Every structure is written in structure tokens, then in C-alpha cells.
Ligand binder design. Structure first.
Ligand SMILES: [Mg+2]
Length: 49
RNA sequence: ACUCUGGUUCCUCUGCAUUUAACCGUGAAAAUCUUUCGCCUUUUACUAAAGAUUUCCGUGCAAAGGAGCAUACAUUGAGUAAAUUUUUGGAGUCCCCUCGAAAGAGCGGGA
């Protein structure tokens, strides 16, 4: 178990630490389109076209 | 006669471990993506199968450098040490006829 959880927590605790020290840069990351958000996204791209 | 090198043990770097039936691992994790099943008023954390990739705990060999211990020159690639029938301890010598200036050559002949 620990063999495989070691790199997973190394990444996760890295991400935890990095936003704890660097702050969270994530403003303007591309939000993806998902179940509820499809129908509003169709209306965006329709009205834009 | 030439150049070629001290044993061991350990550290670390570098390179290679794909023609896999199968196996660097007689052991066995986690993730991502794509798809298909089951949970479910959502997502996460999930179910349990396929396919494709990753990370992680490890493996082998070669080669180079260093560090500790006790100590030995040989030895690798290139290359050393029989008088009794079948070989290396003598069936060897000599003399006529032939062709040819020349010196050999005939299962030639003779002692
Ligand atoms: Mg919502």
C-alpha cells in the first residue's frame, strides 16, 4: 500500500504546501463544461456566433 | 624475448538491461485517460473489468572514480621444450645403353 500511496501523497502534500507558501494562482484557469453547465454554455456560444 | 595487473569489502557517478512465448521482481502498489458495468437526487471518495500511459518500492550487469582493511607476483590478451619393421639416427654407394656440345632421365640394366 505505502509503495503506491507514497508518490500520491508526495504530490498531494506538495500541492498543499505550495499553495500554502506560494498562494493559490488559480484565477483564470479554464473552467471545463460539465452536466449542469452545458445548457448555459450552449447559450454563450450561440449568442457569440 | 613484450605491455599487462596487487587482493578483498564498501560508497558514488555513468551507460545498458524491447526480437519479451515467458522472466530485469519465484514478489506485487497508487494514479491519470478512454470505455463498459453498480452505487446515486451532485461532486469527491468508490464498485470491477478492458485498453493505453505514468509514478513509486525494488533488480541485474559493465565501466570509471574514491574510501577502508589486512599484503602478494605469479598470471591474463599475445606465444616454449623417443638409435630395432610405419616417419627424427641411413638399403646406402658405385658401373654400362640411350638423347645431347652442356646435364640429367627411362618401374633401363649390373655389383
Ligand atoms: Mg451546483
Amino acid at each position: 500500500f505505502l509503495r503506491g500511496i507514497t508518490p500520491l501523497l508526495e504530490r498531494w502534500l506538495g500541492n498543499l504546501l505550495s499553495r500554502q507558501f506560494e498562494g493559490r494562482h488559480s484565477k483564470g484557469v479554464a473552467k471545463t463544461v460539465t452536466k449542469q453547465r452545458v445548457e448555459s454554455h450552449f447559450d454563450l456560444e450561440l449568442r457569440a456566433a
